[PDB]
């Protein structure tokens, strides 16, 4: 199994709660002059009779606490009833030598750097592409409207991941000592974390639905449904931007009401998470069906003409490589390779690898459908010919 600082802090939470409960639930000694019990971010020492040490077993939240489960952290208090002071008047003396001791933290830090650079290339490419597709009035179709909505979806997704990773600065605090673990959990179980992480869940689902809209619109062009345009366009924008709210807010309400701690991370024994991951899988499967049907149409269309041995293969390969970015069909590979029962560091390493590869779908789309496009080059040439005369 894989453990990291995440699991250590999660165990520390339970240890602190348990020791804090036993701190008051423990009956006080009848005699006096005793040394006062406490919990000082490392272990919960009990009352100690004066003139001798206190022998607490090694805390069990430590990653190495199982190798030697008989070491004792040693502390001494004076026979007058005072914890022994260390030199230079610091925290009371305690002996720690008994129990004491690439990695997933560095791994996660590198996957994070590649993913931020990619989502930051995709953001730049798509903002320039949206500007170009909005500037010229000759590029106003309905398919271009769908493209602009898709680009807006990608930009919103890439802006949400930056807000999650710079709200909580986990990329500096991955080497935190004991005295900072309260400030991590305190921020975790707050409301700002919950809302910043629920916004990300909606911006991730809108992005899959605006790729189901692309697929369905292409299919309805090729399956000859020429229904009333205004009804069709309003229906498409609706299914794009407002269907997520049909499975996000039920999840966002059950998690709010029924959970006491945490920042809406996957629950241990329950399975509340299916309200978000079930429709995403549904949309991925449907878009895969649309992809295979459209390829089945294109292959016959180019088989109908007169072509050599290698030109059909070249054209089919080029068409497929052009269509995988728009319909997001690489997700079906990613959905199979992801374990949906892993929690913690295992889950955070599987998810970040997908996000490193699927972070530059937005640059790929913006370069395939706004820069190597024929008509955009044509419009640039037309505008430069006129500006030549002044």
Ligand X SMILES: N#Cc1ccc(COc2cccc(C3CCN(Cc4nc5ccc(C(=O)O)cc5n4C[C@@H]4CCO4)CC3)n2)c(F)c1
- Binding footprint of ligand X on the chain (CB under 6 A): 4-6, 9, 105, 108, 164, 168, 170, 173-174, 184-185, 188, 193, 197, 263, 265-266, 345, 348, 351
CB of 163 to ligand X, least distance (A): 11
Q: Which helix (H) or strand (E) holds 25?
A: helix 5-25
CB of 60 to ligand X, least distance (A): 18
CB of 170 to ligand X, least distance (A): 4
Nearest to ligand X of 236, 352 (CB atom): 352
Q: Which residue reads 């949206």 in tokens? A: 130
Q: For residue 74, what are its two tokens? A: 């040693």
287 and 211 Cβ atoms separated by less than 8 Å: yes
Question: What's phi and psi for 142, nearest 5 deg?
Answer: -90, -35
Residue nearest ligand X (C-beta atom): 170
CB of 359 to ligand X, least distance (A): 13
3-state secondary structure of 77: strand
Identify which of 32, 33, 98, 112 has the alpha carbon closest to the alpha carbon of residue 69.
98
In total, the chain counts a number of residues equal to 390
Nearest to ligand X of 77, 198 (CB atom): 198
Nearest to ligand X of 218, 283 (CB atom): 283
Nearest to ligand X of 132, 196 (CB atom): 196
CB of 111 to ligand X, least distance (A): 10
3-state secondary structure of 56: strand
3-state secondary structure of 263: coil
Nearest to ligand X of 139, 351 (CB atom): 351
Q: Which residue reads 């919960």 in tokens? A: 44
Q: How far is CA 172 from CA 6, 161, 169, 255, 354, in A?
A: 14, 17, 6, 29, 23
95: which strand partners? 74
Nearest to ligand X of 299, 338 (CB atom): 338
Q: What is the number of helices (H) and of strands (E) in the chain?
A: 13, 6
CB of 323 to ligand X, least distance (A): 29
CB of 362 to ligand X, least distance (A): 18
The DSSP result for 312-325, as a single string, is HHHHHHHHHHHHHH
Nearest to ligand X of 108, 212 (CB atom): 108
């Amino acid at each position: 199994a894989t453990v990291s600082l995440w699991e250590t802090v999660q165990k520390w939470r339970e240890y602190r709660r348990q020791c804090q409960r036993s701190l008051t639930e423990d009956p006080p000694p009848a005699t006096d002059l005793f040394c006062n019990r406490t919990f000082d971010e490392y272990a919960c020492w009990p009352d100690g009779e004066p003139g001798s040490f206190v022998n607490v077993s090694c805390p069990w939240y430590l990653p190495w606490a199982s190798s030697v489960p008989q070491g004792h952290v040693y502390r001494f208090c004076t026979a007058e009833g005072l914890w022994l002071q260390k030199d230079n008047s610091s925290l009371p003396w305690r002996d720690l030598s008994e129990c004491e001791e690439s990695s997933p933290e560095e791994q996660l830090l590198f996957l994070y750097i590649i993913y931020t650079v990619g989502y930051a290339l995709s953001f730049s490419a798509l903002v320039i592409a949206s500007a170009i597709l909005l500037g010229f009035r000759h590029l106003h179709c309905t398919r271009n409207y769908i493209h602009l909505n898709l680009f807006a979806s990608f930009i919103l997704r890439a802006l949400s991941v930056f807000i999650k990773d710079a709200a909580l600065k986990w990329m500096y605090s991955t080497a935190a000592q004991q005295h900072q673990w309260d400030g991590l959990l305190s921020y975790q179980d707050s409301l700002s974390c919950r809302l910043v992480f629920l916004l990300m869940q909606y911006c991730v689902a809108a992005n899959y639905y605006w790729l189901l809209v692309e697929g369905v619109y292409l299919y309805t062009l090729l399956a000859f449904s020429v229904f009333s345009e205004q009804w069709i366009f309003r229906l498409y924008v609706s299914i794009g931007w407002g269907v997520p709210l049909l499975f996000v807010v039920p999840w966002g309400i059950v998690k709010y009401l029924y959970e006491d701690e945490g920042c809406w991370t996957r629950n241990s024994n329950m399975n509340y998470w299916l309200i978000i991951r079930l429709p995403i899988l549904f949309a991925i499967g449907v878009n895969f069906l649309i992809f295979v049907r459209v390829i089945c149409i294109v292959v016959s269309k180019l088989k109908a003409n007169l072509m050599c041995k290698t030109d059909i293969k070249c054209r089919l390969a080029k068409s497929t490589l052009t269509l995988i970015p728009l319909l997001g069909t690489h997700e079906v590979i990613f959905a199979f390779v992801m374990d949906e029962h892993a929690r913690g560091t295992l889950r955070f390493i599987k998810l970040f690898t997908e996000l490193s590869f699927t972070s530059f779908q937005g640059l790929m789309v913006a370069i395939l459908y706004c820069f190597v496009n024929n008509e955009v080059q044509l419009e640039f040439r037309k505008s430069w010919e006129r500006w030549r005369l002044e």
